[PDB]
Amino acid sequence: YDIQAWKKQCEELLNLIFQCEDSEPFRQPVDLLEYPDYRDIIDTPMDFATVRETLEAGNYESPMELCKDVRLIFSNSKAYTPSKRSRIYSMSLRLSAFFEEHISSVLSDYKSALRFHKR
């Protein structure tokens, strides 16, 4: 019932994601010099360094907001990919499965703790 615990749980999970080779494409923003059409396709860039900085700045109120930005990393990869068999997109799908496997308990515990708080 700790309604703050999600923040360190997310820091920990971001540390695991940064250790994961599959996060290599989405640590930093897309260099628009290497992908000159990126912003023609993607309205809202997102990456894991931006998510970590937002968290560490105290600019997430809940793990749902962090989850929305991480999911945007993955949806951007899916929107930008020329092929469902692309290397970078394939890395996104594995990393997404990993993230969803790990974030589920963080969301559940937070929502449970908030419900207890508001009982």
Ligand SMILES: COCCNC(=O)N1CCN(C(=O)c2ccc(Cl)o2)CC1
């Ligand atoms: C080392 O990483 C540098 C920053 N990352 C980066 O440039 N990109 C990651 C995002 N992205 C894609 O999701 C994608 C799908 C299919 C193809 Cl190709 O790319 C475009 C490439």
